[PDB]
């Protein structure tokens, strides 16, 4: 067995089934009980993209891994489609973990989690509330709340983001009035909308053959915005984020301040930070050598912490 | 009219219908646009209990009011029953407001909200993220996160609440294994369980004909505990809670400190605090004179701010 594609009931909301791929380690032996890693995808991303890449690479290193599509996203169930409820994205991880505990070849006591981009933020948040998570890893970490409220370069004061909470609120009014769901960009929806080359690379990832995938349109429901602005992925990290934490950020990443934020706020005794030289935010999604370096740091981390 | 019971699709989760009761003011004219107030109920409470009492009496004072059952609770839909996901309890208020915007006789620009006990905390949270809420009021306010993490008396260090986070996490494992849901009391399930008179009065309210209602069993799903511990109903109040805020609490209330916390944290230029002398937490639920006083502060407040 190389991998398994499954759908399973989301224990948080049994009307929804999550779609996921489980990758098995080499010489997989079902009589054994393995360390396992849950992989959460970027904002607007799906299990076939970078998260799947990291899932597969990790499983090559002796773990059972799982890459799932978030509720309302990818091949997972749920309406409205492309909802970006950060609390739900966070709880999804706990649902995937429940699923894992149903598998005899997973050790419930050796389960970890990593995410990329927004998926990292959510992973952090998961680790805070779900004590079954033994260790976490992040790649190009995004605290979605921070990025939408204070800006890509953290130069917007939170109060000045008030018009965004208003827009998300008013969208709920339009949504019920029209019967449609107003949408908003995650990665830029048009190449020219990108304000810098990194964000242009994000557009490029989602809207060109670099990694475009039909279940990843690259927008979210606007109604989520008001919750996103008032969201903090690291909320209470100083108290509860105690699990071992491995951070991986590029040297040229314009998002690195969020990895810095996670690192500084984490209560963890064992918190680590690996800088990838020369890489920007998007570089870690799919640059062969970059992904290889990130794996070379993450796998021994999980091997020793799980 | 006077009194109309309704059910409507929860716009945040269309598989769920909310049950609610709309109360109409004296000489209600449906061709007119009214000020409206959303009433949110205590933890473990329902619309037929104290929330419906406040809704009725506020409607007497000229408002259209609505008392609803939270998703997963009362007569509202959703499984598992008695879920106390604090993010969902908060978002429910936005779903209720969405419903109000479809009613021609309510003025979208004049909607306020109030809650009792935990529903007050949720109201605060709602005001932070839903800018359609123009003013808020609270009675015996509880920030459910605070009460579960730091205790009824605010004397438990947050880190010391870790075994409760663990307990909510492990509940998820046992829930999926057993096909059932572990539960936890909200108010004491037994008179003997009550460590003091105020909490015994909570028991009496929920489990004797004082105010027992069969859709209100008085427990929550244990799985929610981990989210509740890591929750703060007033998260970012210092930034976004700018709306006029009217606080009402009893001088004898052991929960008064959470009203103190709300008042202090709120950015609001117009924040008020009315103490009801001689009242405890539970007295404000159903004591004739105490309720009457609360209403005598709340009605003119909403009158001024909506």
XYZ file of C-alpha atoms in Angstrom:
612
model
C 0.000 0.000 0.000
C 1.333 3.391 -1.050
C -1.709 5.471 -0.097
C -5.458 5.357 0.466
C -8.088 7.857 -0.598
C -10.971 7.992 1.855
C -14.003 10.003 2.832
C -15.070 9.936 6.465
C -17.668 11.630 8.651
C -16.552 14.905 10.238
C -17.143 14.215 13.922
C -17.743 17.964 14.559
C -20.503 18.169 11.981
C -21.746 14.734 10.943
C -23.508 16.182 7.882
C -20.089 16.734 6.336
C -17.613 14.144 5.034
C -13.952 15.067 4.790
C -11.982 13.819 1.773
C -8.386 12.795 2.545
C -5.358 10.818 1.392
C -3.423 8.688 3.863
C 0.193 8.027 2.850
C 1.875 4.905 4.235
C 5.578 4.540 5.088
C 7.859 2.092 3.258
C 7.412 -1.561 4.312
C 4.135 -0.535 5.935
C 2.963 -3.210 8.336
C -0.611 -2.863 9.575
C 0.167 -4.949 12.670
C 2.352 -2.042 13.805
C 1.232 1.225 15.407
C 2.977 4.201 13.806
C 3.668 7.829 14.618
C 1.235 9.884 12.506
C 1.182 13.438 11.097
C -1.855 15.546 10.096
C -1.176 17.974 7.243
C -3.227 21.139 6.900
C -3.256 23.048 3.596
C -2.816 26.799 2.812
C -5.732 29.200 2.579
C -7.508 28.241 -0.621
C -5.337 25.163 -1.098
C -6.270 21.505 -1.337
C -4.791 18.102 -0.457
C -3.444 17.601 -3.997
C -1.198 20.614 -3.767
C 1.730 21.444 -1.495
C 0.166 19.782 1.561
C 0.018 16.517 -0.367
C 3.661 16.950 -1.320
C 4.715 17.325 2.295
C 2.418 14.480 3.310
C 4.026 12.095 0.823
C 7.585 13.208 1.616
C 6.966 12.793 5.357
C 5.477 9.326 4.880
C 8.648 8.409 3.009
C 10.438 9.140 6.298
C 8.661 6.464 8.330
C 5.390 8.125 9.334
C 1.753 7.472 8.489
C 0.531 10.829 7.181
C -2.772 12.337 6.151
C -3.604 15.254 3.873
C -7.263 16.313 4.071
C -9.414 18.935 2.382
C -10.949 21.337 4.919
C -14.698 21.390 5.473
C -16.443 23.412 2.738
C -13.380 23.016 0.538
C -11.692 20.743 -2.008
C -13.537 17.427 -2.261
C -14.888 17.694 1.279
C -18.603 18.270 1.872
C -20.332 21.324 3.302
C -22.156 24.418 2.118
C -21.527 27.259 1.551
C -18.551 26.203 -0.590
C -15.211 27.913 0.153
C -16.289 29.056 3.623
C -13.246 30.261 5.574
C -14.473 29.978 9.136
C -11.152 29.918 11.017
C -12.697 28.155 14.027
C -13.990 25.424 11.721
C -10.674 25.155 9.847
C -9.081 24.707 13.251
C -11.593 22.114 14.519
C -11.254 20.146 11.270
C -7.861 19.045 12.514
C -9.463 17.479 15.614
C -11.909 15.674 13.341
C -9.060 14.244 11.265
C -7.369 13.154 14.503
C -10.533 11.333 15.626
C -10.461 9.548 12.288
C -6.807 8.582 12.850
C -7.676 7.141 16.282
C -10.088 4.855 14.466
C -7.092 3.241 12.667
C -5.363 0.332 14.417
C -2.023 1.146 12.747
C -1.801 4.573 14.362
C -0.545 5.177 17.900
C -3.015 7.667 19.462
C -0.180 8.777 21.729
C 2.176 9.589 18.866
C 0.139 11.976 16.684
C 1.563 15.249 15.409
C 0.516 17.968 12.992
C 1.969 20.406 10.512
C 0.527 22.971 8.133
C 1.569 25.319 5.361
C 0.555 28.974 5.087
C -2.844 29.438 6.772
C -2.735 25.735 7.561
C 0.152 26.355 9.924
C -1.770 29.005 11.832
C -4.658 26.613 12.179
C -2.264 23.843 13.216
C -1.029 26.147 15.955
C -4.480 26.823 17.040
C -5.289 23.120 16.985
C -2.322 22.346 19.175
C -3.600 24.853 21.673
C -7.003 23.240 22.084
C -6.407 19.622 21.139
C -3.988 18.026 23.597
C -3.771 14.871 21.496
C -1.387 16.824 19.262
C 2.073 15.951 20.553
C 4.169 18.209 18.319
C 3.689 20.694 15.479
C 5.611 21.897 12.443
C 5.063 24.981 10.307
C 6.115 25.878 6.749
C 5.675 29.504 5.624
C 3.337 30.017 8.592
C 0.360 32.354 8.174
C -1.855 33.497 11.028
C -4.814 34.289 8.761
C -6.166 36.758 11.317
C -2.881 38.653 11.370
C -2.540 38.778 7.599
C -6.065 40.091 6.988
C -6.227 42.454 9.984
C -2.715 43.901 10.062
C -1.659 43.313 6.468
C 0.902 41.192 4.619
C 3.662 43.432 5.973
C 2.062 43.983 9.394
C 1.732 47.728 8.808
C -2.006 48.209 9.408
C -3.331 49.015 12.887
C -6.115 46.687 13.991
C -8.656 49.486 14.468
C -8.042 50.557 10.859
C -9.240 47.108 9.770
C -12.714 47.901 11.107
C -14.071 48.455 7.552
C -13.254 44.790 6.896
C -15.326 43.589 9.834
C -18.081 45.810 8.484
C -17.784 44.350 4.995
C -17.952 40.774 6.295
C -20.998 41.722 8.378
C -22.843 43.405 5.525
C -22.060 40.441 3.251
C -24.167 38.274 5.532
C -27.057 40.617 4.847
C -26.486 40.419 1.050
C -26.045 36.686 1.188
C -29.458 36.071 2.696
C -31.058 38.744 0.522
C -29.722 37.390 -2.777
C -29.400 33.668 -2.059
C -25.849 33.891 -3.396
C -22.574 33.878 -1.479
C -20.345 36.932 -1.935
C -16.728 35.975 -2.532
C -13.312 37.490 -1.829
C -9.744 36.710 -2.916
C -7.437 34.541 -0.860
C -4.340 34.505 -3.041
C -4.788 37.361 -5.572
C -7.428 36.339 -8.127
C -5.733 38.240 -10.925
C -2.005 38.518 -11.610
C -2.063 42.327 -11.676
C -3.829 42.525 -8.286
C -0.679 41.281 -6.567
C 1.146 44.198 -4.865
C 4.513 42.385 -4.707
C 6.345 39.513 -6.419
C 5.608 37.044 -3.573
C 1.865 37.568 -3.828
C 2.210 37.387 -7.636
C 3.793 33.996 -7.081
C 0.767 33.035 -4.972
C -1.563 34.028 -7.824
C 0.735 32.043 -10.081
C 0.531 28.945 -7.866
C -3.267 28.945 -7.896
C -4.036 30.175 -11.432
C -1.415 28.714 -13.785
C -0.094 25.215 -14.448
C 2.428 25.767 -11.623
C -0.115 24.085 -9.322
C -3.682 25.020 -10.334
C -6.335 22.443 -9.366
C -10.078 22.467 -10.160
C -11.270 22.132 -6.543
C -9.068 25.079 -5.487
C -10.647 28.245 -7.049
C -8.614 30.542 -4.797
C -11.493 32.500 -3.293
C -13.407 32.349 0.008
C -16.897 33.463 1.061
C -16.802 37.172 1.984
C -19.106 36.474 4.981
C -16.076 34.890 6.751
C -14.096 38.120 6.690
C -15.550 39.546 9.885
C -14.558 36.411 11.808
C -11.145 36.346 10.158
C -10.259 39.911 11.112
C -11.193 39.219 14.718
C -9.307 35.884 14.672
C -5.900 35.107 16.219
C -4.428 31.710 15.308
C -2.028 31.856 18.276
C -4.659 32.932 20.828
C -3.381 31.873 24.300
C -0.142 30.332 22.909
C 1.727 31.775 25.909
C -0.272 29.498 28.206
C -1.281 26.390 26.279
C 1.066 26.077 23.301
C 3.507 23.842 25.165
C 4.049 21.033 22.659
C 7.366 20.863 20.780
C 7.216 23.271 17.839
C 9.373 23.292 14.688
C 9.198 26.434 12.580
C 10.434 26.548 8.977
C 10.520 29.911 7.193
C 12.356 31.265 4.145
C 14.983 33.993 4.542
C 13.222 36.166 1.920
C 9.674 35.459 3.098
C 7.564 38.592 3.562
C 5.449 36.503 5.950
C 8.361 35.551 8.227
C 7.142 37.930 10.992
C 4.274 35.511 11.673
C 6.700 32.628 12.200
C 8.598 35.002 14.464
C 5.326 35.746 16.274
C 4.524 32.054 16.763
C 8.079 31.365 17.955
C 8.063 34.229 20.461
C 4.590 33.528 21.843
C 4.923 29.744 22.097
C 5.303 28.554 25.672
C 7.105 25.460 24.386
C 10.317 24.405 26.105
C 11.339 22.736 22.866
C 10.645 25.314 20.161
C 12.834 25.385 17.063
C 13.318 27.731 14.114
C 14.874 26.718 10.781
C 15.624 29.510 8.301
C 15.698 28.445 4.654
C 18.331 30.647 3.012
C 17.313 32.468 -0.152
C 13.717 31.250 -0.092
C 10.610 33.438 -0.061
C 7.099 32.437 1.109
C 6.059 30.522 -2.045
C 9.496 28.936 -2.520
C 8.696 26.410 0.230
C 5.522 25.191 -1.470
C 7.186 23.460 -4.403
C 10.871 24.308 -4.941
C 12.413 20.797 -5.007
C 15.566 21.636 -3.077
C 13.628 23.880 -0.684
C 10.970 21.247 0.044
C 13.758 18.716 0.493
C 15.505 20.952 3.046
C 12.255 21.542 4.946
C 11.635 17.790 5.056
C 15.208 17.154 6.170
C 14.489 19.398 9.162
C 10.900 18.314 9.921
C 11.208 14.540 9.786
C 13.940 14.136 12.430
C 11.960 16.645 14.517
C 8.817 14.518 14.388
C 10.837 11.327 14.752
C 12.187 12.500 18.114
C 9.011 14.222 19.399
C 6.380 11.609 18.508
C -50.158 40.833 17.010
C -48.370 39.757 20.185
C -46.323 36.592 19.942
C -45.192 34.430 17.013
C -43.115 31.227 17.038
C -40.995 30.660 13.962
C -38.266 28.469 12.538
C -35.689 29.471 9.966
C -32.605 28.144 8.180
C -29.355 29.016 9.999
C -27.475 30.883 7.293
C -24.107 29.792 8.788
C -25.117 26.128 8.561
C -28.193 25.615 6.336
C -28.657 22.008 7.533
C -29.779 23.511 10.848
C -33.032 25.390 11.523
C -33.263 27.754 14.479
C -36.431 27.865 16.585
C -37.363 31.306 17.880
C -40.192 33.443 19.260
C -40.775 36.972 17.969
C -42.422 39.396 20.412
C -44.292 42.393 19.007
C -44.573 45.768 20.811
C -47.819 47.611 21.760
C -49.808 48.789 18.708
C -47.465 46.973 16.353
C -47.825 48.147 12.760
C -46.120 45.893 10.214
C -45.929 48.754 7.700
C -43.582 50.496 10.126
C -39.885 49.787 10.776
C -39.016 48.909 14.357
C -35.946 48.818 16.563
C -35.130 45.154 17.249
C -33.256 43.247 19.955
C -31.867 39.720 19.765
C -32.097 37.845 23.067
C -29.460 35.164 23.730
C -30.016 32.582 26.486
C -27.849 31.295 29.402
C -25.595 28.278 29.001
C -27.931 25.288 29.074
C -30.889 27.631 28.784
C -33.665 27.999 26.219
C -35.986 30.682 24.798
C -38.874 29.690 27.086
C -36.859 30.541 30.187
C -35.377 33.856 31.364
C -34.420 34.958 27.837
C -38.067 34.858 26.731
C -39.012 36.790 29.847
C -36.621 39.602 29.004
C -37.693 39.464 25.348
C -41.367 39.763 26.270
C -40.817 42.622 28.693
C -38.545 44.571 26.327
C -41.162 44.170 23.621
C -43.622 45.770 26.050
C -41.399 48.853 25.918
C -41.737 49.287 22.155
C -39.254 46.906 20.493
C -39.605 43.943 18.206
C -37.669 41.258 20.089
C -36.556 37.733 19.253
C -35.636 34.933 21.656
C -34.023 31.969 19.863
C -32.707 28.528 20.789
C -28.989 28.107 20.065
C -27.969 25.648 17.321
C -27.812 22.101 18.760
C -30.071 23.207 21.644
C -33.693 23.857 22.624
C -35.952 23.198 19.653
C -33.284 24.243 17.136
C -31.755 21.593 14.883
C -28.270 20.127 14.863
C -26.391 17.070 16.073
C -24.815 16.335 18.485
C -27.369 17.733 20.899
C -26.136 20.137 23.598
C -22.971 21.060 21.727
C -21.553 24.171 23.350
C -19.171 25.351 20.655
C -18.662 28.972 21.763
C -17.828 30.102 18.220
C -21.094 28.662 16.983
C -23.047 30.113 19.919
C -21.536 33.464 18.963
C -22.210 33.129 15.190
C -25.837 32.060 15.827
C -26.533 35.686 16.771
C -25.437 36.730 13.272
C -27.708 34.086 11.796
C -30.621 35.488 13.829
C -29.777 39.027 12.602
C -29.695 37.692 9.043
C -33.236 36.439 9.615
C -34.295 39.817 11.034
C -33.070 41.577 7.890
C -35.617 39.646 5.835
C -38.464 41.003 7.938
C -39.821 44.268 6.482
C -41.023 45.529 9.845
C -37.533 45.635 11.346
C -35.105 48.474 10.637
C -31.763 46.927 9.643
C -29.971 49.992 11.022
C -31.513 49.730 14.502
C -30.728 46.204 15.740
C -29.332 45.636 19.165
C -28.595 42.597 21.289
C -28.663 41.376 24.834
C -27.900 38.138 26.667
C -28.130 36.618 30.135
C -25.356 34.479 31.679
C -23.216 32.835 28.951
C -25.453 34.332 26.269
C -24.244 37.725 27.460
C -20.653 36.729 26.783
C -21.686 35.488 23.359
C -23.472 38.806 22.788
C -20.275 40.648 23.530
C -18.416 38.419 21.113
C -21.115 38.979 18.530
C -20.861 42.749 18.880
C -17.136 42.509 18.272
C -17.447 40.635 14.974
C -20.874 41.640 13.707
C -21.026 45.380 13.080
C -24.762 45.290 12.406
C -25.188 45.184 16.210
C -25.663 48.812 17.242
C -25.697 48.449 21.033
C -25.544 45.620 23.555
C -26.857 44.830 27.048
C -25.912 42.102 29.534
C -27.618 40.599 32.595
C -25.614 38.392 34.994
C -22.986 38.300 32.256
C -20.843 35.168 31.966
C -17.770 34.819 29.738
C -18.036 31.027 29.459
C -14.354 30.653 28.681
C -13.423 32.581 31.807
C -15.791 30.663 34.025
C -14.541 27.251 32.891
C -10.815 28.191 32.779
C -10.409 30.350 35.895
C -13.397 29.199 37.941
C -16.685 30.663 39.181
C -14.607 32.811 41.539
C -11.782 33.626 39.117
C -9.271 31.845 41.342
C -7.883 29.148 39.032
C -4.704 29.950 37.097
C -5.328 29.287 33.392
C -2.467 26.813 33.022
C -3.982 24.823 35.908
C -7.034 24.302 33.709
C -4.956 22.150 31.313
C -6.482 18.827 32.524
C -9.851 20.219 31.385
C -8.469 20.918 27.926
C -7.121 17.362 27.997
C -10.536 16.093 29.099
C -12.266 17.786 26.164
C -9.665 16.385 23.800
C -10.001 12.823 25.062
C -13.790 13.107 24.905
C -13.404 13.411 21.151
C -11.528 10.091 21.105
C -14.153 8.330 23.219
C -17.046 9.919 21.310
C -15.878 8.531 17.959
C -15.050 5.136 19.424
C -18.374 4.678 21.237
C -20.752 6.339 18.774
C -22.012 8.403 21.742
C -21.278 11.781 23.377
C -19.761 12.332 26.802
C -21.455 15.123 28.751
C -20.683 17.666 31.455
C -22.956 19.676 33.740
C -23.492 23.353 33.103
C -25.479 24.234 36.203
C -25.263 21.551 38.929
C -27.229 18.450 37.843
C -27.860 17.664 41.507
C -28.790 19.948 44.417
C -26.026 18.270 46.427
C -23.444 19.028 43.694
C -23.879 22.735 44.325
C -20.888 24.077 46.293
C -22.866 27.176 47.315
C -26.322 28.736 47.513
C -26.125 30.666 44.215
C -25.165 27.506 42.305
C -27.844 25.585 44.217
C -30.256 28.191 42.957
C -28.936 27.483 39.453
C -29.711 23.781 40.034
C -33.176 24.732 41.310
C -33.805 26.963 38.303
C -32.948 24.244 35.811
C -34.172 21.059 37.509
C -37.298 21.972 39.504
C -40.583 23.588 38.309
C -39.045 26.981 39.162
C -38.006 27.078 35.504
C -37.291 23.530 34.308
C -37.977 23.120 30.591
C -37.654 19.728 28.900
C -35.611 20.915 25.886
C -33.082 22.262 28.413
C -31.420 19.218 30.008
C -28.720 21.314 31.677
C -25.622 19.617 30.354
C -23.270 20.176 27.392
C -21.175 17.789 25.298
C -17.831 17.184 27.025
C -16.083 17.523 23.641
C -16.736 21.285 23.750
C -14.736 21.714 26.945
C -11.411 22.082 25.157
C -12.772 24.887 22.968
C -14.419 26.516 25.959
C -11.274 26.633 28.104
C -9.325 28.256 25.266
C -12.134 30.764 24.544
C -12.499 34.432 25.512
C -15.896 36.014 24.834
C -14.331 39.465 24.993
C -11.434 38.684 22.661
C -10.253 42.032 21.174
C -12.891 44.062 23.069
C -10.295 46.801 23.611
C -10.222 47.284 19.838
C -13.600 46.412 18.304
C -16.190 46.572 21.083
C -17.034 50.202 20.383
C -20.828 50.018 20.540
C -22.814 51.412 23.474
C -22.816 48.753 26.170
C -25.194 48.470 29.132
C -24.145 46.142 31.924
C -26.537 44.937 34.623
C -25.350 42.764 37.527
C -26.416 41.989 41.094
C -24.385 43.378 44.007
C -24.344 39.845 45.472
C -23.523 38.043 42.208
C -20.494 35.749 42.432
C -20.205 36.250 38.677
C -20.013 40.076 38.936
C -16.301 40.045 38.124
C -17.018 39.074 34.497
C -19.216 42.156 34.145
C -16.374 44.141 35.682
C -14.090 42.524 33.084
C -16.404 43.417 30.176
C -16.834 46.996 31.373
C -13.101 47.519 31.809
C -12.064 45.906 28.516
C -14.671 47.514 26.234
C -13.395 50.357 24.065
C -16.949 51.808 24.020
C -17.211 55.523 24.752
C -20.740 54.901 25.985
C -20.444 52.070 28.499
C -22.697 51.874 31.523
C -22.882 49.684 34.607
C -26.024 49.323 36.691
C -25.822 47.377 39.934
C -29.023 45.786 41.188
C -28.604 46.049 44.971
C -29.273 42.883 46.946
C -29.504 40.590 43.900
C -27.336 37.548 43.183
C -26.611 35.942 39.781
C -29.819 33.896 39.673
C -32.109 36.580 41.128
C -31.916 38.516 37.846
C -33.342 35.530 35.935
C -36.799 35.503 37.522
C -37.248 37.796 40.556
C -40.170 40.097 39.670
C -38.739 43.307 41.118
C -35.180 42.494 40.016
C -36.228 41.769 36.437
C -38.411 44.876 36.489
C -35.433 46.992 37.531
C -33.177 45.412 34.894
C -35.805 46.236 32.270
C -36.100 49.775 33.670
C -32.406 50.255 32.846
C -32.247 48.263 29.588
C -35.302 49.645 27.791
C -34.352 53.343 27.931
C -30.769 52.392 27.055
C -31.830 50.614 23.872
C -34.271 53.474 23.329
C -31.370 55.927 23.270
C -28.904 53.866 21.264
C -30.951 52.071 18.610
